[PDB]
RNA sequence: GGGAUGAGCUGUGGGUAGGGGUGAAAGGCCAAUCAAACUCCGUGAUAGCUGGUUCUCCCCGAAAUGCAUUUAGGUGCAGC
């Protein structure tokens, strides 16, 4: 009853990771680290 | 300082247009840009390259080696 009583099951929904938002999280390279290809592009699986 | 009746200078009007013109030839000039003008479009071209990437705390925590490579400042797999 009463729409203000519905809550999702625990573990069903978890917040997305925002990756370029300061030093306390994935800071500036956003997990990329490198200076090479992988810092700006993807490497094809076939290469 | 050079020429200053000459292969002179100059006005007005016109013509040659981009891998094309024009050049007593320097790759010179073609609207302050020229070893291929400019504008718009393809187009948010591509760049193994440079730069940038924004709030917090808790736990753990490297590598800079091997192999191969049109490879050596890149990448794949292993190692961590
Ligand atoms: Mg910073
Ligand atoms: Mg990562
Ligand atoms: Mg890398
Ligand atoms: Mg490096
Ligand atoms: Mg950087
Ligand atoms: Mg593909
Ligand atoms: Mg004319
Ligand atoms: Mg020459
Ligand atoms: Mg000019
Ligand atoms: Mg041209
Ligand atoms: Mg060309
Ligand atoms: Mg296209
Ligand atoms: Mg520790």
Report how this structure was experimentally obtained. Answer: cryo-EM
The residue length of chain A stands at 47
Q: What is the largest CA-CA distance in chain A?
A: 57
Nearest to A32 by CA among A44, A20, A24: A20
Q: CA separation (Å) from A21 to A5, A17, A18?
A: 33, 10, 7
Q: CA separation (Å) from A30 to A3, A26, A38, A44?
A: 39, 5, 12, 20
Q: Is A31:A19 a contact under the CB 8 Å cutoff?
A: yes
DSSP symbols for A3-45: GGG--PPTTS--PPPP-SS-TTSS-SSTT---SSGGGTS---T
Q: CA separation (Å) from A27 to A15, A18, A30?
A: 17, 10, 6
- In angstroms, this model's resolution equals 2.7
User: Within 7 A of a protein CB, which nucleotides of strand B?
Assistant: 47-57, 73-76
| A36 CA from centroid of ligand 2 (Å) | 14
Q: Is A7:A17 a contact under the CB 8 Å cutoff?
A: no
DSSP code of residue A46 = T
């Amino acid at each position: 009853l009463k729409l203000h009583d519905l809550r999702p099951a625990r573990g069903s929904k978890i917040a997305r990771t925002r990756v370029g938002r300061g030093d306390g999280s994935k800071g500036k390279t956003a997990g990329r680290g490198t200076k090479g290809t992988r810092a700006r592009k993807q490497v094809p699986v076939t290469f």
